[PDB]
Amino acid sequence: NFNGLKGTGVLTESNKKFLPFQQFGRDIADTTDAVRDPQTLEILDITPC
Amino acid sequence: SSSGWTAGAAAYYVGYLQPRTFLLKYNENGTITDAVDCALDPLS
Ligand SMILES: *[C@@H]1O[C@H](CO)[C@@H](O[C@@H]2O[C@H](CO)[C@@H](O)[C@H](O)[C@H]2NC(C)=O)[C@H](O)[C@H]1NC(C)=O
Numbered sequence: 001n002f003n004g005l006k007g008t009g010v011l012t013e014s015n016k017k018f019l020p021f022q023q024f025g026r027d028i029a030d031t032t033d034a035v036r037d038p039q040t041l042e043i044l045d046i047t048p049c
Numbered sequence: 050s051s052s053g054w055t056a057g058a059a060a061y062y063v064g065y066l067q068p069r070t071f072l073l074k075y076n077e078n079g080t081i082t083d084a085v086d087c088a089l090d091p092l093s
Pocket of ligand 1: 017076077078
């Protein structure tokens with residue numbers, strides 16, 4: 001429930017760099033892939049298992 | 050002083066914005082590298 005992003009998946013570790021204002025990653029299908037954890041700042045790739 | 054002032058060179062340029070459709074080509078990172086306008090050319 002990361003801030004209003006309901007869904008089911010596996011929160012792995014990724015290696016992409018975010019700009020200071022960009023928060024939500026996306027793709028062609030407009031489904032969120034990369035979300036930055038609200039309390040600690042890092043990258044968590046979202047993949048359905 | 051006021052009657053004749055010597056200062057360094059400077060320049061400021063002003064343009065004007067008009068509504069258009071753009072294409073943006075994102076890099077492997079989040080930086081925007083190229084942009085293409087549509088109302089410029091037949092090839093565009
Ligand atoms: C995208 O970002 C990556 C790193 O986040 C850049 O990769 C590094 O770029 C510097 C500067 O050119 C090099 O000194 C490093 O050797 C690069 N690292 C690797 C592992 O290759 C990359 O240049 C950026 N741009 C693109 C188009 O990928």
